[PDB]
Design a binder for this molecule. Structure first.
Ligand SMILES: Nc1ncnc2c1ncn2[C@@H]1O[C@H](COP(=O)(O)OP(=O)(O)OP(=O)(O)O)[C@@H](O)[C@H]1O
Ligand SMILES: [Mg+2]
Lengths: 148, 97
C-alpha cells in the first residue's frame, strides 16, 4: 500500500510516487532532536537496561535473538504515573541509536474530515518501513486506545 | 498577549477543537516572546473520567494535545502560559503535575 497519482477527470493510475512522498510527517532528528542523552537522565537504571534491550538491542544484534530462539520485543508500552520521566528515557534512545525516529502524537491521527485519520495511520507505517529500521513514538496514545 | 477563554475553543466539529489549540502556540512562537493566557481551565483540564459520554471523551482529545504541546520534544523558547483556575483539585493530575 503506497501513494500513487491519479488523473482527476477519469480516475486512472497515470503514474506512481515514491514511498517518501505524501506524508504529513517526516523523520526529525536532523537538528530537531533534544540534547538529552543517557547521561542527562539521572537514575532508573533497571528501566534503562530494560528499555535498551527492548528497543536498541533488536536492531544492533538481530542475530542473537534468532540464535537463542527467543521472541524479540515488538511494541513497547510505557505505563507509570505522570512525572516519572517516561518520555525522557525515550528521548535518550532517539539520539543514541542513530536510526530513523519519527515523531507523532495521537492527535495527529484525529482530523476534521472523516476517515482522513486512517489515511495517516497507513502513512506513518509505510514511511517507517522505507527508512527501516525505524522507531515510531506516539507520545500520548490515550485517545486512540480508549476502552469504551 | 493572547487572551483565550478555555471554553470557546471547543467546537462541535471533530478535532477542529484541537486544531485551534496547536495553532495558538504556533502563532505564539512566531511572535516570541509571547504569553498564552487561559481562563477557567476546569473546562478542558477536567478530571480523567473515561466512563463519561461522547461529549467528555472529546475533552480527552483536546487535553491530551495541549499536554504534549507544553512539553514534548518540541521545546518552547520564551512562550509562557499563565493558567487560572477556580480549583486545582478538579484539574487533571497530568496537567497539574
Ligand atoms: N531521572 C531523571 N533525571 C532528570 N530529570 C528527570 C528525571 N526524571 C524526570 N526528569 C524531569 O522531568 C521532566 C518531565 O518528564 P517527562 O515529560 O519525561 O514525563 P512523563 O512521566 O512521561 O509525563 P507526561 O505524560 O505528563 O508527559 C523531564 O523533562 C525532566 O526534566
Ligand atoms: Mg501525556
Amino acid at each position: 500500500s503506497m501513494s500513487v497519482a491519479l488523473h482527476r477527470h477519469s480516475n486512472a493510475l497515470v503514474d506512481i510516487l515514491p514511498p517518501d512522498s505524501d506524508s504529513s510527517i517526516s523523520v526529525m532528528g536532523e537538528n530537531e532532536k533534544p540534547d538529552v542523552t543517557y547521561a542527562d537522565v539521572g537514575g532508573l537504571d533497571m528501566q534503562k537496561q530494560e528499555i535498551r534491550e527492548a528497543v536498541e538491542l533488536p536492531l544492533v544484534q538481530a542475530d542473537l535473538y534468532e540464535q537463542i530462539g527467543i521472541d524479540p520485543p515488538r511494541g513497547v508500552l510505557l505505563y507509570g504515573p505522570p512525572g516519572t520521566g517516561k518520555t525522557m528515557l525515550v528521548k535518550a534512545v532517539a539520539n543514541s541509536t542513530k536510526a530513523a525516529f519519527i515523531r507523532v502524537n495521537g492527535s495527529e491521527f484525529v482530523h476534521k474530515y472523516l476517515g482522513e485519520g486512517p489515511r495517516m495511520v497507513r502513512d506513518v507505517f509505510r514511511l517507517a518501513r522505507e527508512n527501516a529500521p525505524s522507531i515510531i513514538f506516539i507520545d500520548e496514545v490515550d485517545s486512540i486506545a480508549t476502552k469504551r | 498577549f493572547i487572551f483565550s477563554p478555555a471554553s470557546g475553543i471547543v467546537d462541535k466539529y471533530i478535532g477542529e477543537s484541537a486544531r485551534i489549540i496547536r495553532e495558538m502556540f504556533a502563532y505564539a512562537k512566531e511572535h516570541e516572546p509571547c504569553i498564552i493566557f487561559m481562563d477557567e481551565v476546569d473546562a478542558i483540564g477536567g478530571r480523567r473520567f473515561s466512563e463519561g459520554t461522547s461529549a467528555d471523551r472529546e475533552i480527552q482529545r483536546t487535553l491530551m494535545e495541549l499536554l504534549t504541546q507544553m512539553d514534548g520534544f518540541d521545546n518552547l523558547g520564551q512562550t509562557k502560559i499563565i493558567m487560572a483556575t477556580n480549583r486545582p483539585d478538579t484539574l487533571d493530575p497530568a496537567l497539574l503535575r
